[PDB]
Amino acid sequence: GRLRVVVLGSTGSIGTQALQVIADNPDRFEVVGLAAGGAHLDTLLRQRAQTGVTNIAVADEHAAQRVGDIPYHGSDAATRLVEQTEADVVLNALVGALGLRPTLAALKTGARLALANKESLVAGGSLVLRAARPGQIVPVDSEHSALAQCLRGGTPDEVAKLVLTASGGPFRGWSAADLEHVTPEQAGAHPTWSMGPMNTLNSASLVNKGLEVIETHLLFGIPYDRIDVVVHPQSIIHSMVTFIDGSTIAQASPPDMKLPISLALGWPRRVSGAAAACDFHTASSWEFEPLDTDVFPAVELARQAGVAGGCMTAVYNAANEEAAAAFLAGRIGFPAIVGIIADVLHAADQWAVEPATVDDVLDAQRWARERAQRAVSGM
Amino acid sequence: GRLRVVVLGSTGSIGTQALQVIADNPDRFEVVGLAAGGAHLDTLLRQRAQTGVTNIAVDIPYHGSDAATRLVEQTEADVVLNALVGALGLRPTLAALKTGARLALANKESLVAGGSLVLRAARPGQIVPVDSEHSALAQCLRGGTPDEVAKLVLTASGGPFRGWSAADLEHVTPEQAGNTLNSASLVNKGLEVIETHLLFGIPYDRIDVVVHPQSIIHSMVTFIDGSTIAQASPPDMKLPISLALGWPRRVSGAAAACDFHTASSWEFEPLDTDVFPAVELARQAGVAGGCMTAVYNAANEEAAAAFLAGRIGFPAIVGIIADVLHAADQWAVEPATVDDVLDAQRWARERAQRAVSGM
Ligand SMILES: O=CN(O)CC[C@@H](c1ccc(Cl)c(Cl)c1)P(=O)(O)O
Ligand SMILES: [Mn+2]
Ligand SMILES: [Mn+2]
């Protein structure tokens, strides 16, 4: 009954909330491993003491002089912890490229993979899928957790559409003329060394929803032309599934990541008390409006990248990362982010091949960065 | 496989929509029986000509007051759709349950009045609800295991008198109040709360009601983790009808899906329970149990008919229900037979008829 859980990226927001859910539920879960990057060593050490878990990894080569009591340390240390720790669930909340090999290791162990790491699916694609058994991957992000829940409303052949909700970002309702000369700071993105301003920027450009559509297709096996996005400013409905009879099943809750976290850890069994439920003691309004696709082409661009297939979704994300960073540095304008992604994709015919190995993914990403860097330099 | 369907109350809104679902899906469904009252005789005759079904209850093979019941007894069927109105539905419900066939239940009276009697007559999962709220709940319940259900949340339109005060209600006419009258009085939601308890076996203090004027969300299930699963569609009874007949399989093209190409707002607000106490009274009646929900419904039907005859005001409908229920001390006994139910209803009608005459 007690599930053995490895928490990768234990020091970030998702990691710390999962440990909190586990801490509140020692009857359901037992932490058996922790991993984090060398920059976060001090927090990891505090976590070792608090949990009593000695099976810990420093996920990279950093903090090299401060390692000497850490059982795994070095570039692929998180992957080694996963390969070597008996577990029922691996929560992968590592950020970026660090998350991919641990994902593949996790799947090869036969454990459930509670996946928070976006690169795993977006860059890894079928490399990751080929390693998974049906139902082995359970998503942690709000939208995908909602979808996994709503898909219980019928059989796979009864599914008509998957409908992701989107907040709309800071620029919901704005015209293309209005967005021509917006600044990073106006996007809510105040550039910092963390992923925060980049996540915020992705929300503003709708690239994040583009990424989520890609993940939706890979997770649930639904064609891109049946994955819709609806703007829903309140973010109470986290996503929905429309079935062949006209019925839509939606999942709703006040925003709290502990709900989808708990469900991913405990799948298929729900975790009593993870989050507060919707309260109807107060009058409220849930609004829905179409996405302005002419103004926010990032989502359709993701569909194009996804339809092309293979390493094309890795290209999409790597191109975004470069174009986005350039916008953060004041080197390009806002509309050029998605303009550059499209330019890079148009030049990327060699990268539609399905990845045979991790190196294929890494090669596609390196090529995409170079291409984006050239595109940036030319304006 | 192809399912053989008997449609009781074929000439009404539900029945005709059902026949349309069946005609659109000849590979899934086949009509094998039709039952009608007598008012819309022209429709029944037209239905016979289109379906070819001669096995009809009202050269009519089954006539009388127990005709629909006897149609059920002797026809080979996989599904019986009971869309009859009121008292005419009780016996056909019990007879359909006796055949072992699936009961696609639209007639509220059967469950609400019969209660435990109907439940004893039923095997697990034999009753599949046609009601939009209960169809929604059944689908949303797929979101977890029975042990993970925290609450069932029924949505209510609020009726045309949403916002109105007790004084405002004093001056409504039969045409202003428009089932539709029960919607307006909130007695419908009272009846659906009882129905929900009996269908899904959830305590009354874990069945909530929220007013949702758009009627897009048809109901919701909240689970122990804090997740709420909701069912949404443009208002169209063909959806829950199609699902009831083909349960657990969904029927392609049954209804239009929610279309998000145009902006919309789904509003939620608390029920004004002081102006609309019908639901709390149904909880009182349901918790008391036994024959009390038969009393609840019969008291309504009598008080509602008085309003429709112009004999009483609108706020008197639910007022009389409360009066009859408070005198109903004796009726918190489980009905052993159909006659116990009919005695409860007679008692309720007469006590209601007195209240009407007293004022
Ligand atoms: O199943 C439906 N009913 O029982 C009708 C009554 C409820 C209702 C449901 C949907 C619509 Cl669009 C309308 Cl107008 C009315 P209620 O008014 O009790 O919510
Ligand atoms: Mn998300
Ligand atoms: Mn209803």
Q: Name chain A contacts of B150, Cβ cutoff 8 Å.
A: 277
Instruction: List all residues 6 or more positions away from A299 whose beta carbon is below 8 Å from its beta carbon.
Output: A206, A209, A210, A213, A229, A291, A293
Count how many Cα atoms sit within 13 Å of the Cα of residue B276 in the half-sphere of its side chain. 25
In angstroms, what CA-CA distances link B105 with B9, B89, B99? Answer: 11, 10, 15
Instruction: List all residues 6 or more positions away from A81 whose beta carbon is below 8 Å from its beta carbon.
Output: A6, A8, A33, A35, A55, A56, A57, A71, A72
- In chain B, positions 264-303, which contact chain A (CB-CB < 8 Å)? 264-270
Among chain B residues, the shortest Cα distance to A247 is held by B233
- In chain B, positions 120-149, which contact chain A (CB-CB < 8 Å)? 139-140, 142-145, 148
Closest by CA to B141, choosing from B245, B234, B227, B235, is B227
Which technique was the structure solved with, according to the deposited record? X-ray
C-beta of residue B321 within 8 angstroms of C-beta of residue B187:
yes
- From CA B253, how far away is CA B80, in angstroms rounded? 22
Q: How far is the CA of A13 from the centre of ligand 1 (A)?
A: 43
Secondary element (H or E) of residue A5: strand A3-8
- Is A171 in a helix, a strand, or coil? coil
Closest by CA to B192, choosing from B112, B122, B128, B124, is B112
- From CA B181, how far away is CA B143, in angstroms rounded? 33
Q: What is the dihedral of CA A170, A174, A178, A179, to 10 degrees?
A: 50
- From CA B167, how far away is CA B307, in angstroms rounded? 16
C-beta of residue B99 within 8 angstroms of C-beta of residue B5:
no
- Is B20 in a helix, a strand, or coil? helix
- Is A63 in a helix, a strand, or coil? coil
C-beta of residue B276 within 8 angstroms of C-beta of residue B330:
no
Q: Which tokens belong to A11?
A: 């020091």
B261 and A CB contact within 8 Å: yes
- From CA A42, how far away is CA A31, in angstroms rounded? 19
- From CA B273, how far away is CA A325, in angstroms rounded? 56
- From CA A330, how far away is CA B49, in angstroms rounded? 76
Q: How far is the CA of B65 from the centre of ligand 3 (A)?
A: 27
Q: Which tokens belong to B94?
A: 């019990």
Instruction: Test A284 with B267 for CB contact under 8 angstroms.
Output: yes
A247 and B CB contact within 8 Å: yes
- Number of alpha helices (DSSP H) and beta strands (DSSP E) in chain B: 15, 11
C-beta of residue B212 within 8 angstroms of C-beta of residue B271:
no
A249 and B CB contact within 8 Å: yes
- From CA A54, how far away is CA B157, in angstroms rounded? 57
| Start-to-end CA span in chain A (Å) | 59
Q: What is the dihedral of CA B86, B319, B289, B202, to 10 degrees?
A: 90
Instruction: Test A245 with B260 for CB contact under 8 angstroms.
Output: no
Instruction: Test B227 with A263 for CB contact under 8 angstroms.
Output: yes
C-beta of residue A22 within 8 angstroms of C-beta of residue A34:
no
Owner of token pair 């329970």: B273
Q: Name chain B contacts of A259, Cβ cutoff 8 Å.
A: 225-227
C-beta of residue A343 within 8 angstroms of C-beta of residue A323:
no
Instruction: Name the H helices within chain A.
Output: 13-24, 41-51, 77-84, 100-108, 118-122, 126-131, 142-150, 176-179, 196-205, 207-220, 258-266, 298-308, 312-328, 335-346, 358-377
| Start-to-end CA span in chain B (Å) | 58
Owner of token pair 């034999």: B126
Q: Which tokens belong to A48?
A: 């070792």
Closest by CA to B266, choosing from B236, B224, B289, B235, is B235
- Is A75 in a helix, a strand, or coil? coil
Nearest to A272 among B140, B145, B224 (CB): B224
* One-letter amino acid for residue B262 of the chain: T
B60 and A CB contact within 8 Å: no
Q: In testing the pocket of ligand 1, which one of B183, B211, B219, B231 has its CB within 8 Å of the most ligand atoms?
A: B183
Owner of token pair 């082409």: A297
- List, edge to edge, every strand of the sheet that includes A56-58: A72-73, A56-58, A29-36, A3-8, A89-92, A112-115, A137-139
- From CA A317, how far away is CA A124, in angstroms rounded? 11
- From CA A20, how far away is CA A14, in angstroms rounded? 10
Q: Which residues of B212-231 are buried (b: 16+ CB within 10 A; e: fewer)?
A: bbbbbbbbbbbbbbbbbbbb
In angstroms, what CA-CA distances link B222 with A200, B51, B144, B204? Answer: 31, 42, 10, 15
Residue A346 zone, left/alpha/beta (φ > 0; ψ -120 to 50; rest): alpha
Neighbours of B342 (CB within 10 A): 16
Closest by CA to B271, choosing from B177, B175, B181, B187, is B187
Q: How far is the CA of B180 from the centre of ligand 1 (A)?
A: 8
Cis amide prior to A197 (ω within 30 degrees): no
* One-letter amino acid for residue A379 of the chain: M
The β-bridge relationship of strands A89-92 and A72-73 is: unpaired
Count how many Cα atoms sit within 13 Å of the Cα of residue A154 in the half-sphere of its side chain. 27
Q: Which tokens belong to A4?
A: 């053995």
- From CA A98, how far away is CA A76, in angstroms rounded? 8
Q: How far is the CA of A143 from the centre of ligand 2 (A)?
A: 5
Closest by CA to B209, choosing from B184, B227, B192, B231, is B192
In angstroms, what CA-CA distances link A186 with A74, A166, A190, A334? Answer: 39, 19, 8, 10
Q: Which tokens belong to A3?
A: 């599930």
For residue A163, give how far its alpha carbon lies from the nearest alpha carbon of chain B (Å). Answer: 9
Instruction: List all residues 6 or more positions away from A247 whose beta carbon is below 8 Å from its beta carbon.
Output: A153, A154, B139, B231, B232, B233, B239, B243, B250, B255, B257
Give a three-class secondary structure readout of B43-103: HHHHHHHHHCCCCEECCCCECCCCHHHHHHHHCCCCEEEECCCHHHHHHHHHHHHHCCCEE
Instruction: Test A285 with B262 for CB contact under 8 angstroms.
Output: no
Handedness of CA A229, A230, A233, A238 (dihedral sign): negative
- From CA A136, how far away is CA B348, in angstroms rounded? 58
Give a three-class secondary structure readout of B176-224: CCCCHHHHHHCHHHHHHHHHHHHHHCCCHHHEEEEECCCCCEEEEEEEC
Closest by CA to B216, choosing from B265, B251, B160, B181, is B265
- In chain B, positions 166-195, which contact chain A (CB-CB < 8 Å)? none
Backbone angles phi, psi at A78, to 5 degrees: -60, -40
- From CA B245, how far away is CA B55, in angstroms rounded? 19
Instruction: List all residues 6 or more positions away from A213 whose beta carbon is below 8 Å from its beta carbon.
Output: A164, A224, A227, A229, A299, A302, A303, A306
Instruction: Test A244 with B222 for CB contact under 8 angstroms.
Output: no
What is the separation of C-alpha A261 from the centre of its chain, rounded to a whole number of angstroms? Answer: 13
- From CA A264, how far away is CA A242, in angstroms rounded? 23
Angle at A291 between CA A144 and CA A304, to 5 degrees: 70
Instruction: Test A281 with B264 for CB contact under 8 angstroms.
Output: no
Q: Which tokens belong to A100?
A: 């991919």
Q: How far is the CA of A89 from the centre of ligand 2 (A)?
A: 21
Resolution (A): 2.0
C-beta of residue B81 within 8 angstroms of C-beta of residue B130:
yes
Q: Which domains does chain B have, with CATH numbers?
A: 1-131 (3.40.50.720), 132-272 (no CATH), 273-359 (1.10.1740.10)
C-beta of residue A369 within 8 angstroms of C-beta of residue A321:
yes
For residue A210, give how far its alpha carbon lies from the nearest alpha carbon of chain B (Å). Answer: 18
Q: How far is the CA of A20 from the centre of ligand 1 (A)?
A: 43
A150 and B CB contact within 8 Å: yes
Ligand 1 pocket, residues with Cβ under 6 angstroms = B 131-133, 156-157, 159, 183, 188-189, 215, 235
Handedness of CA B306, B312, B318, B321 (dihedral sign): negative
B226 and A CB contact within 8 Å: yes
Q: Which tokens belong to A350?
A: 């060699």
Q: Which atom of ligand 1 has the smallest separation from the CA of B155?
A: 19
Secondary element (H or E) of residue A230: strand A227-231
Backbone angles phi, psi at A279, to 5 degrees: -110, 130
C-beta of residue A316 within 8 angstroms of C-beta of residue A210:
yes
Instruction: List all residues 6 or more positions away from A291 whose beta carbon is below 8 Å from its beta carbon.
Output: A166, A168, A206, A229, A230, A231, A299
- From CA B287, how far away is CA B151, in angstroms rounded? 17
Instruction: Test B266 with A285 for CB contact under 8 angstroms.
Output: yes
In angstroms, what CA-CA distances link B91 with B70, B170, B203, B284, B298? Answer: 10, 37, 27, 26, 16
Closest by CA to A285, choosing from B263, B269, B273, is B269
Judged by its nearest atom, the ligand closest to the C-alpha of residue B237 is: 1
The strand pairing partners of A284, in sequence order, are: B268
- Is A163 in a helix, a strand, or coil? strand
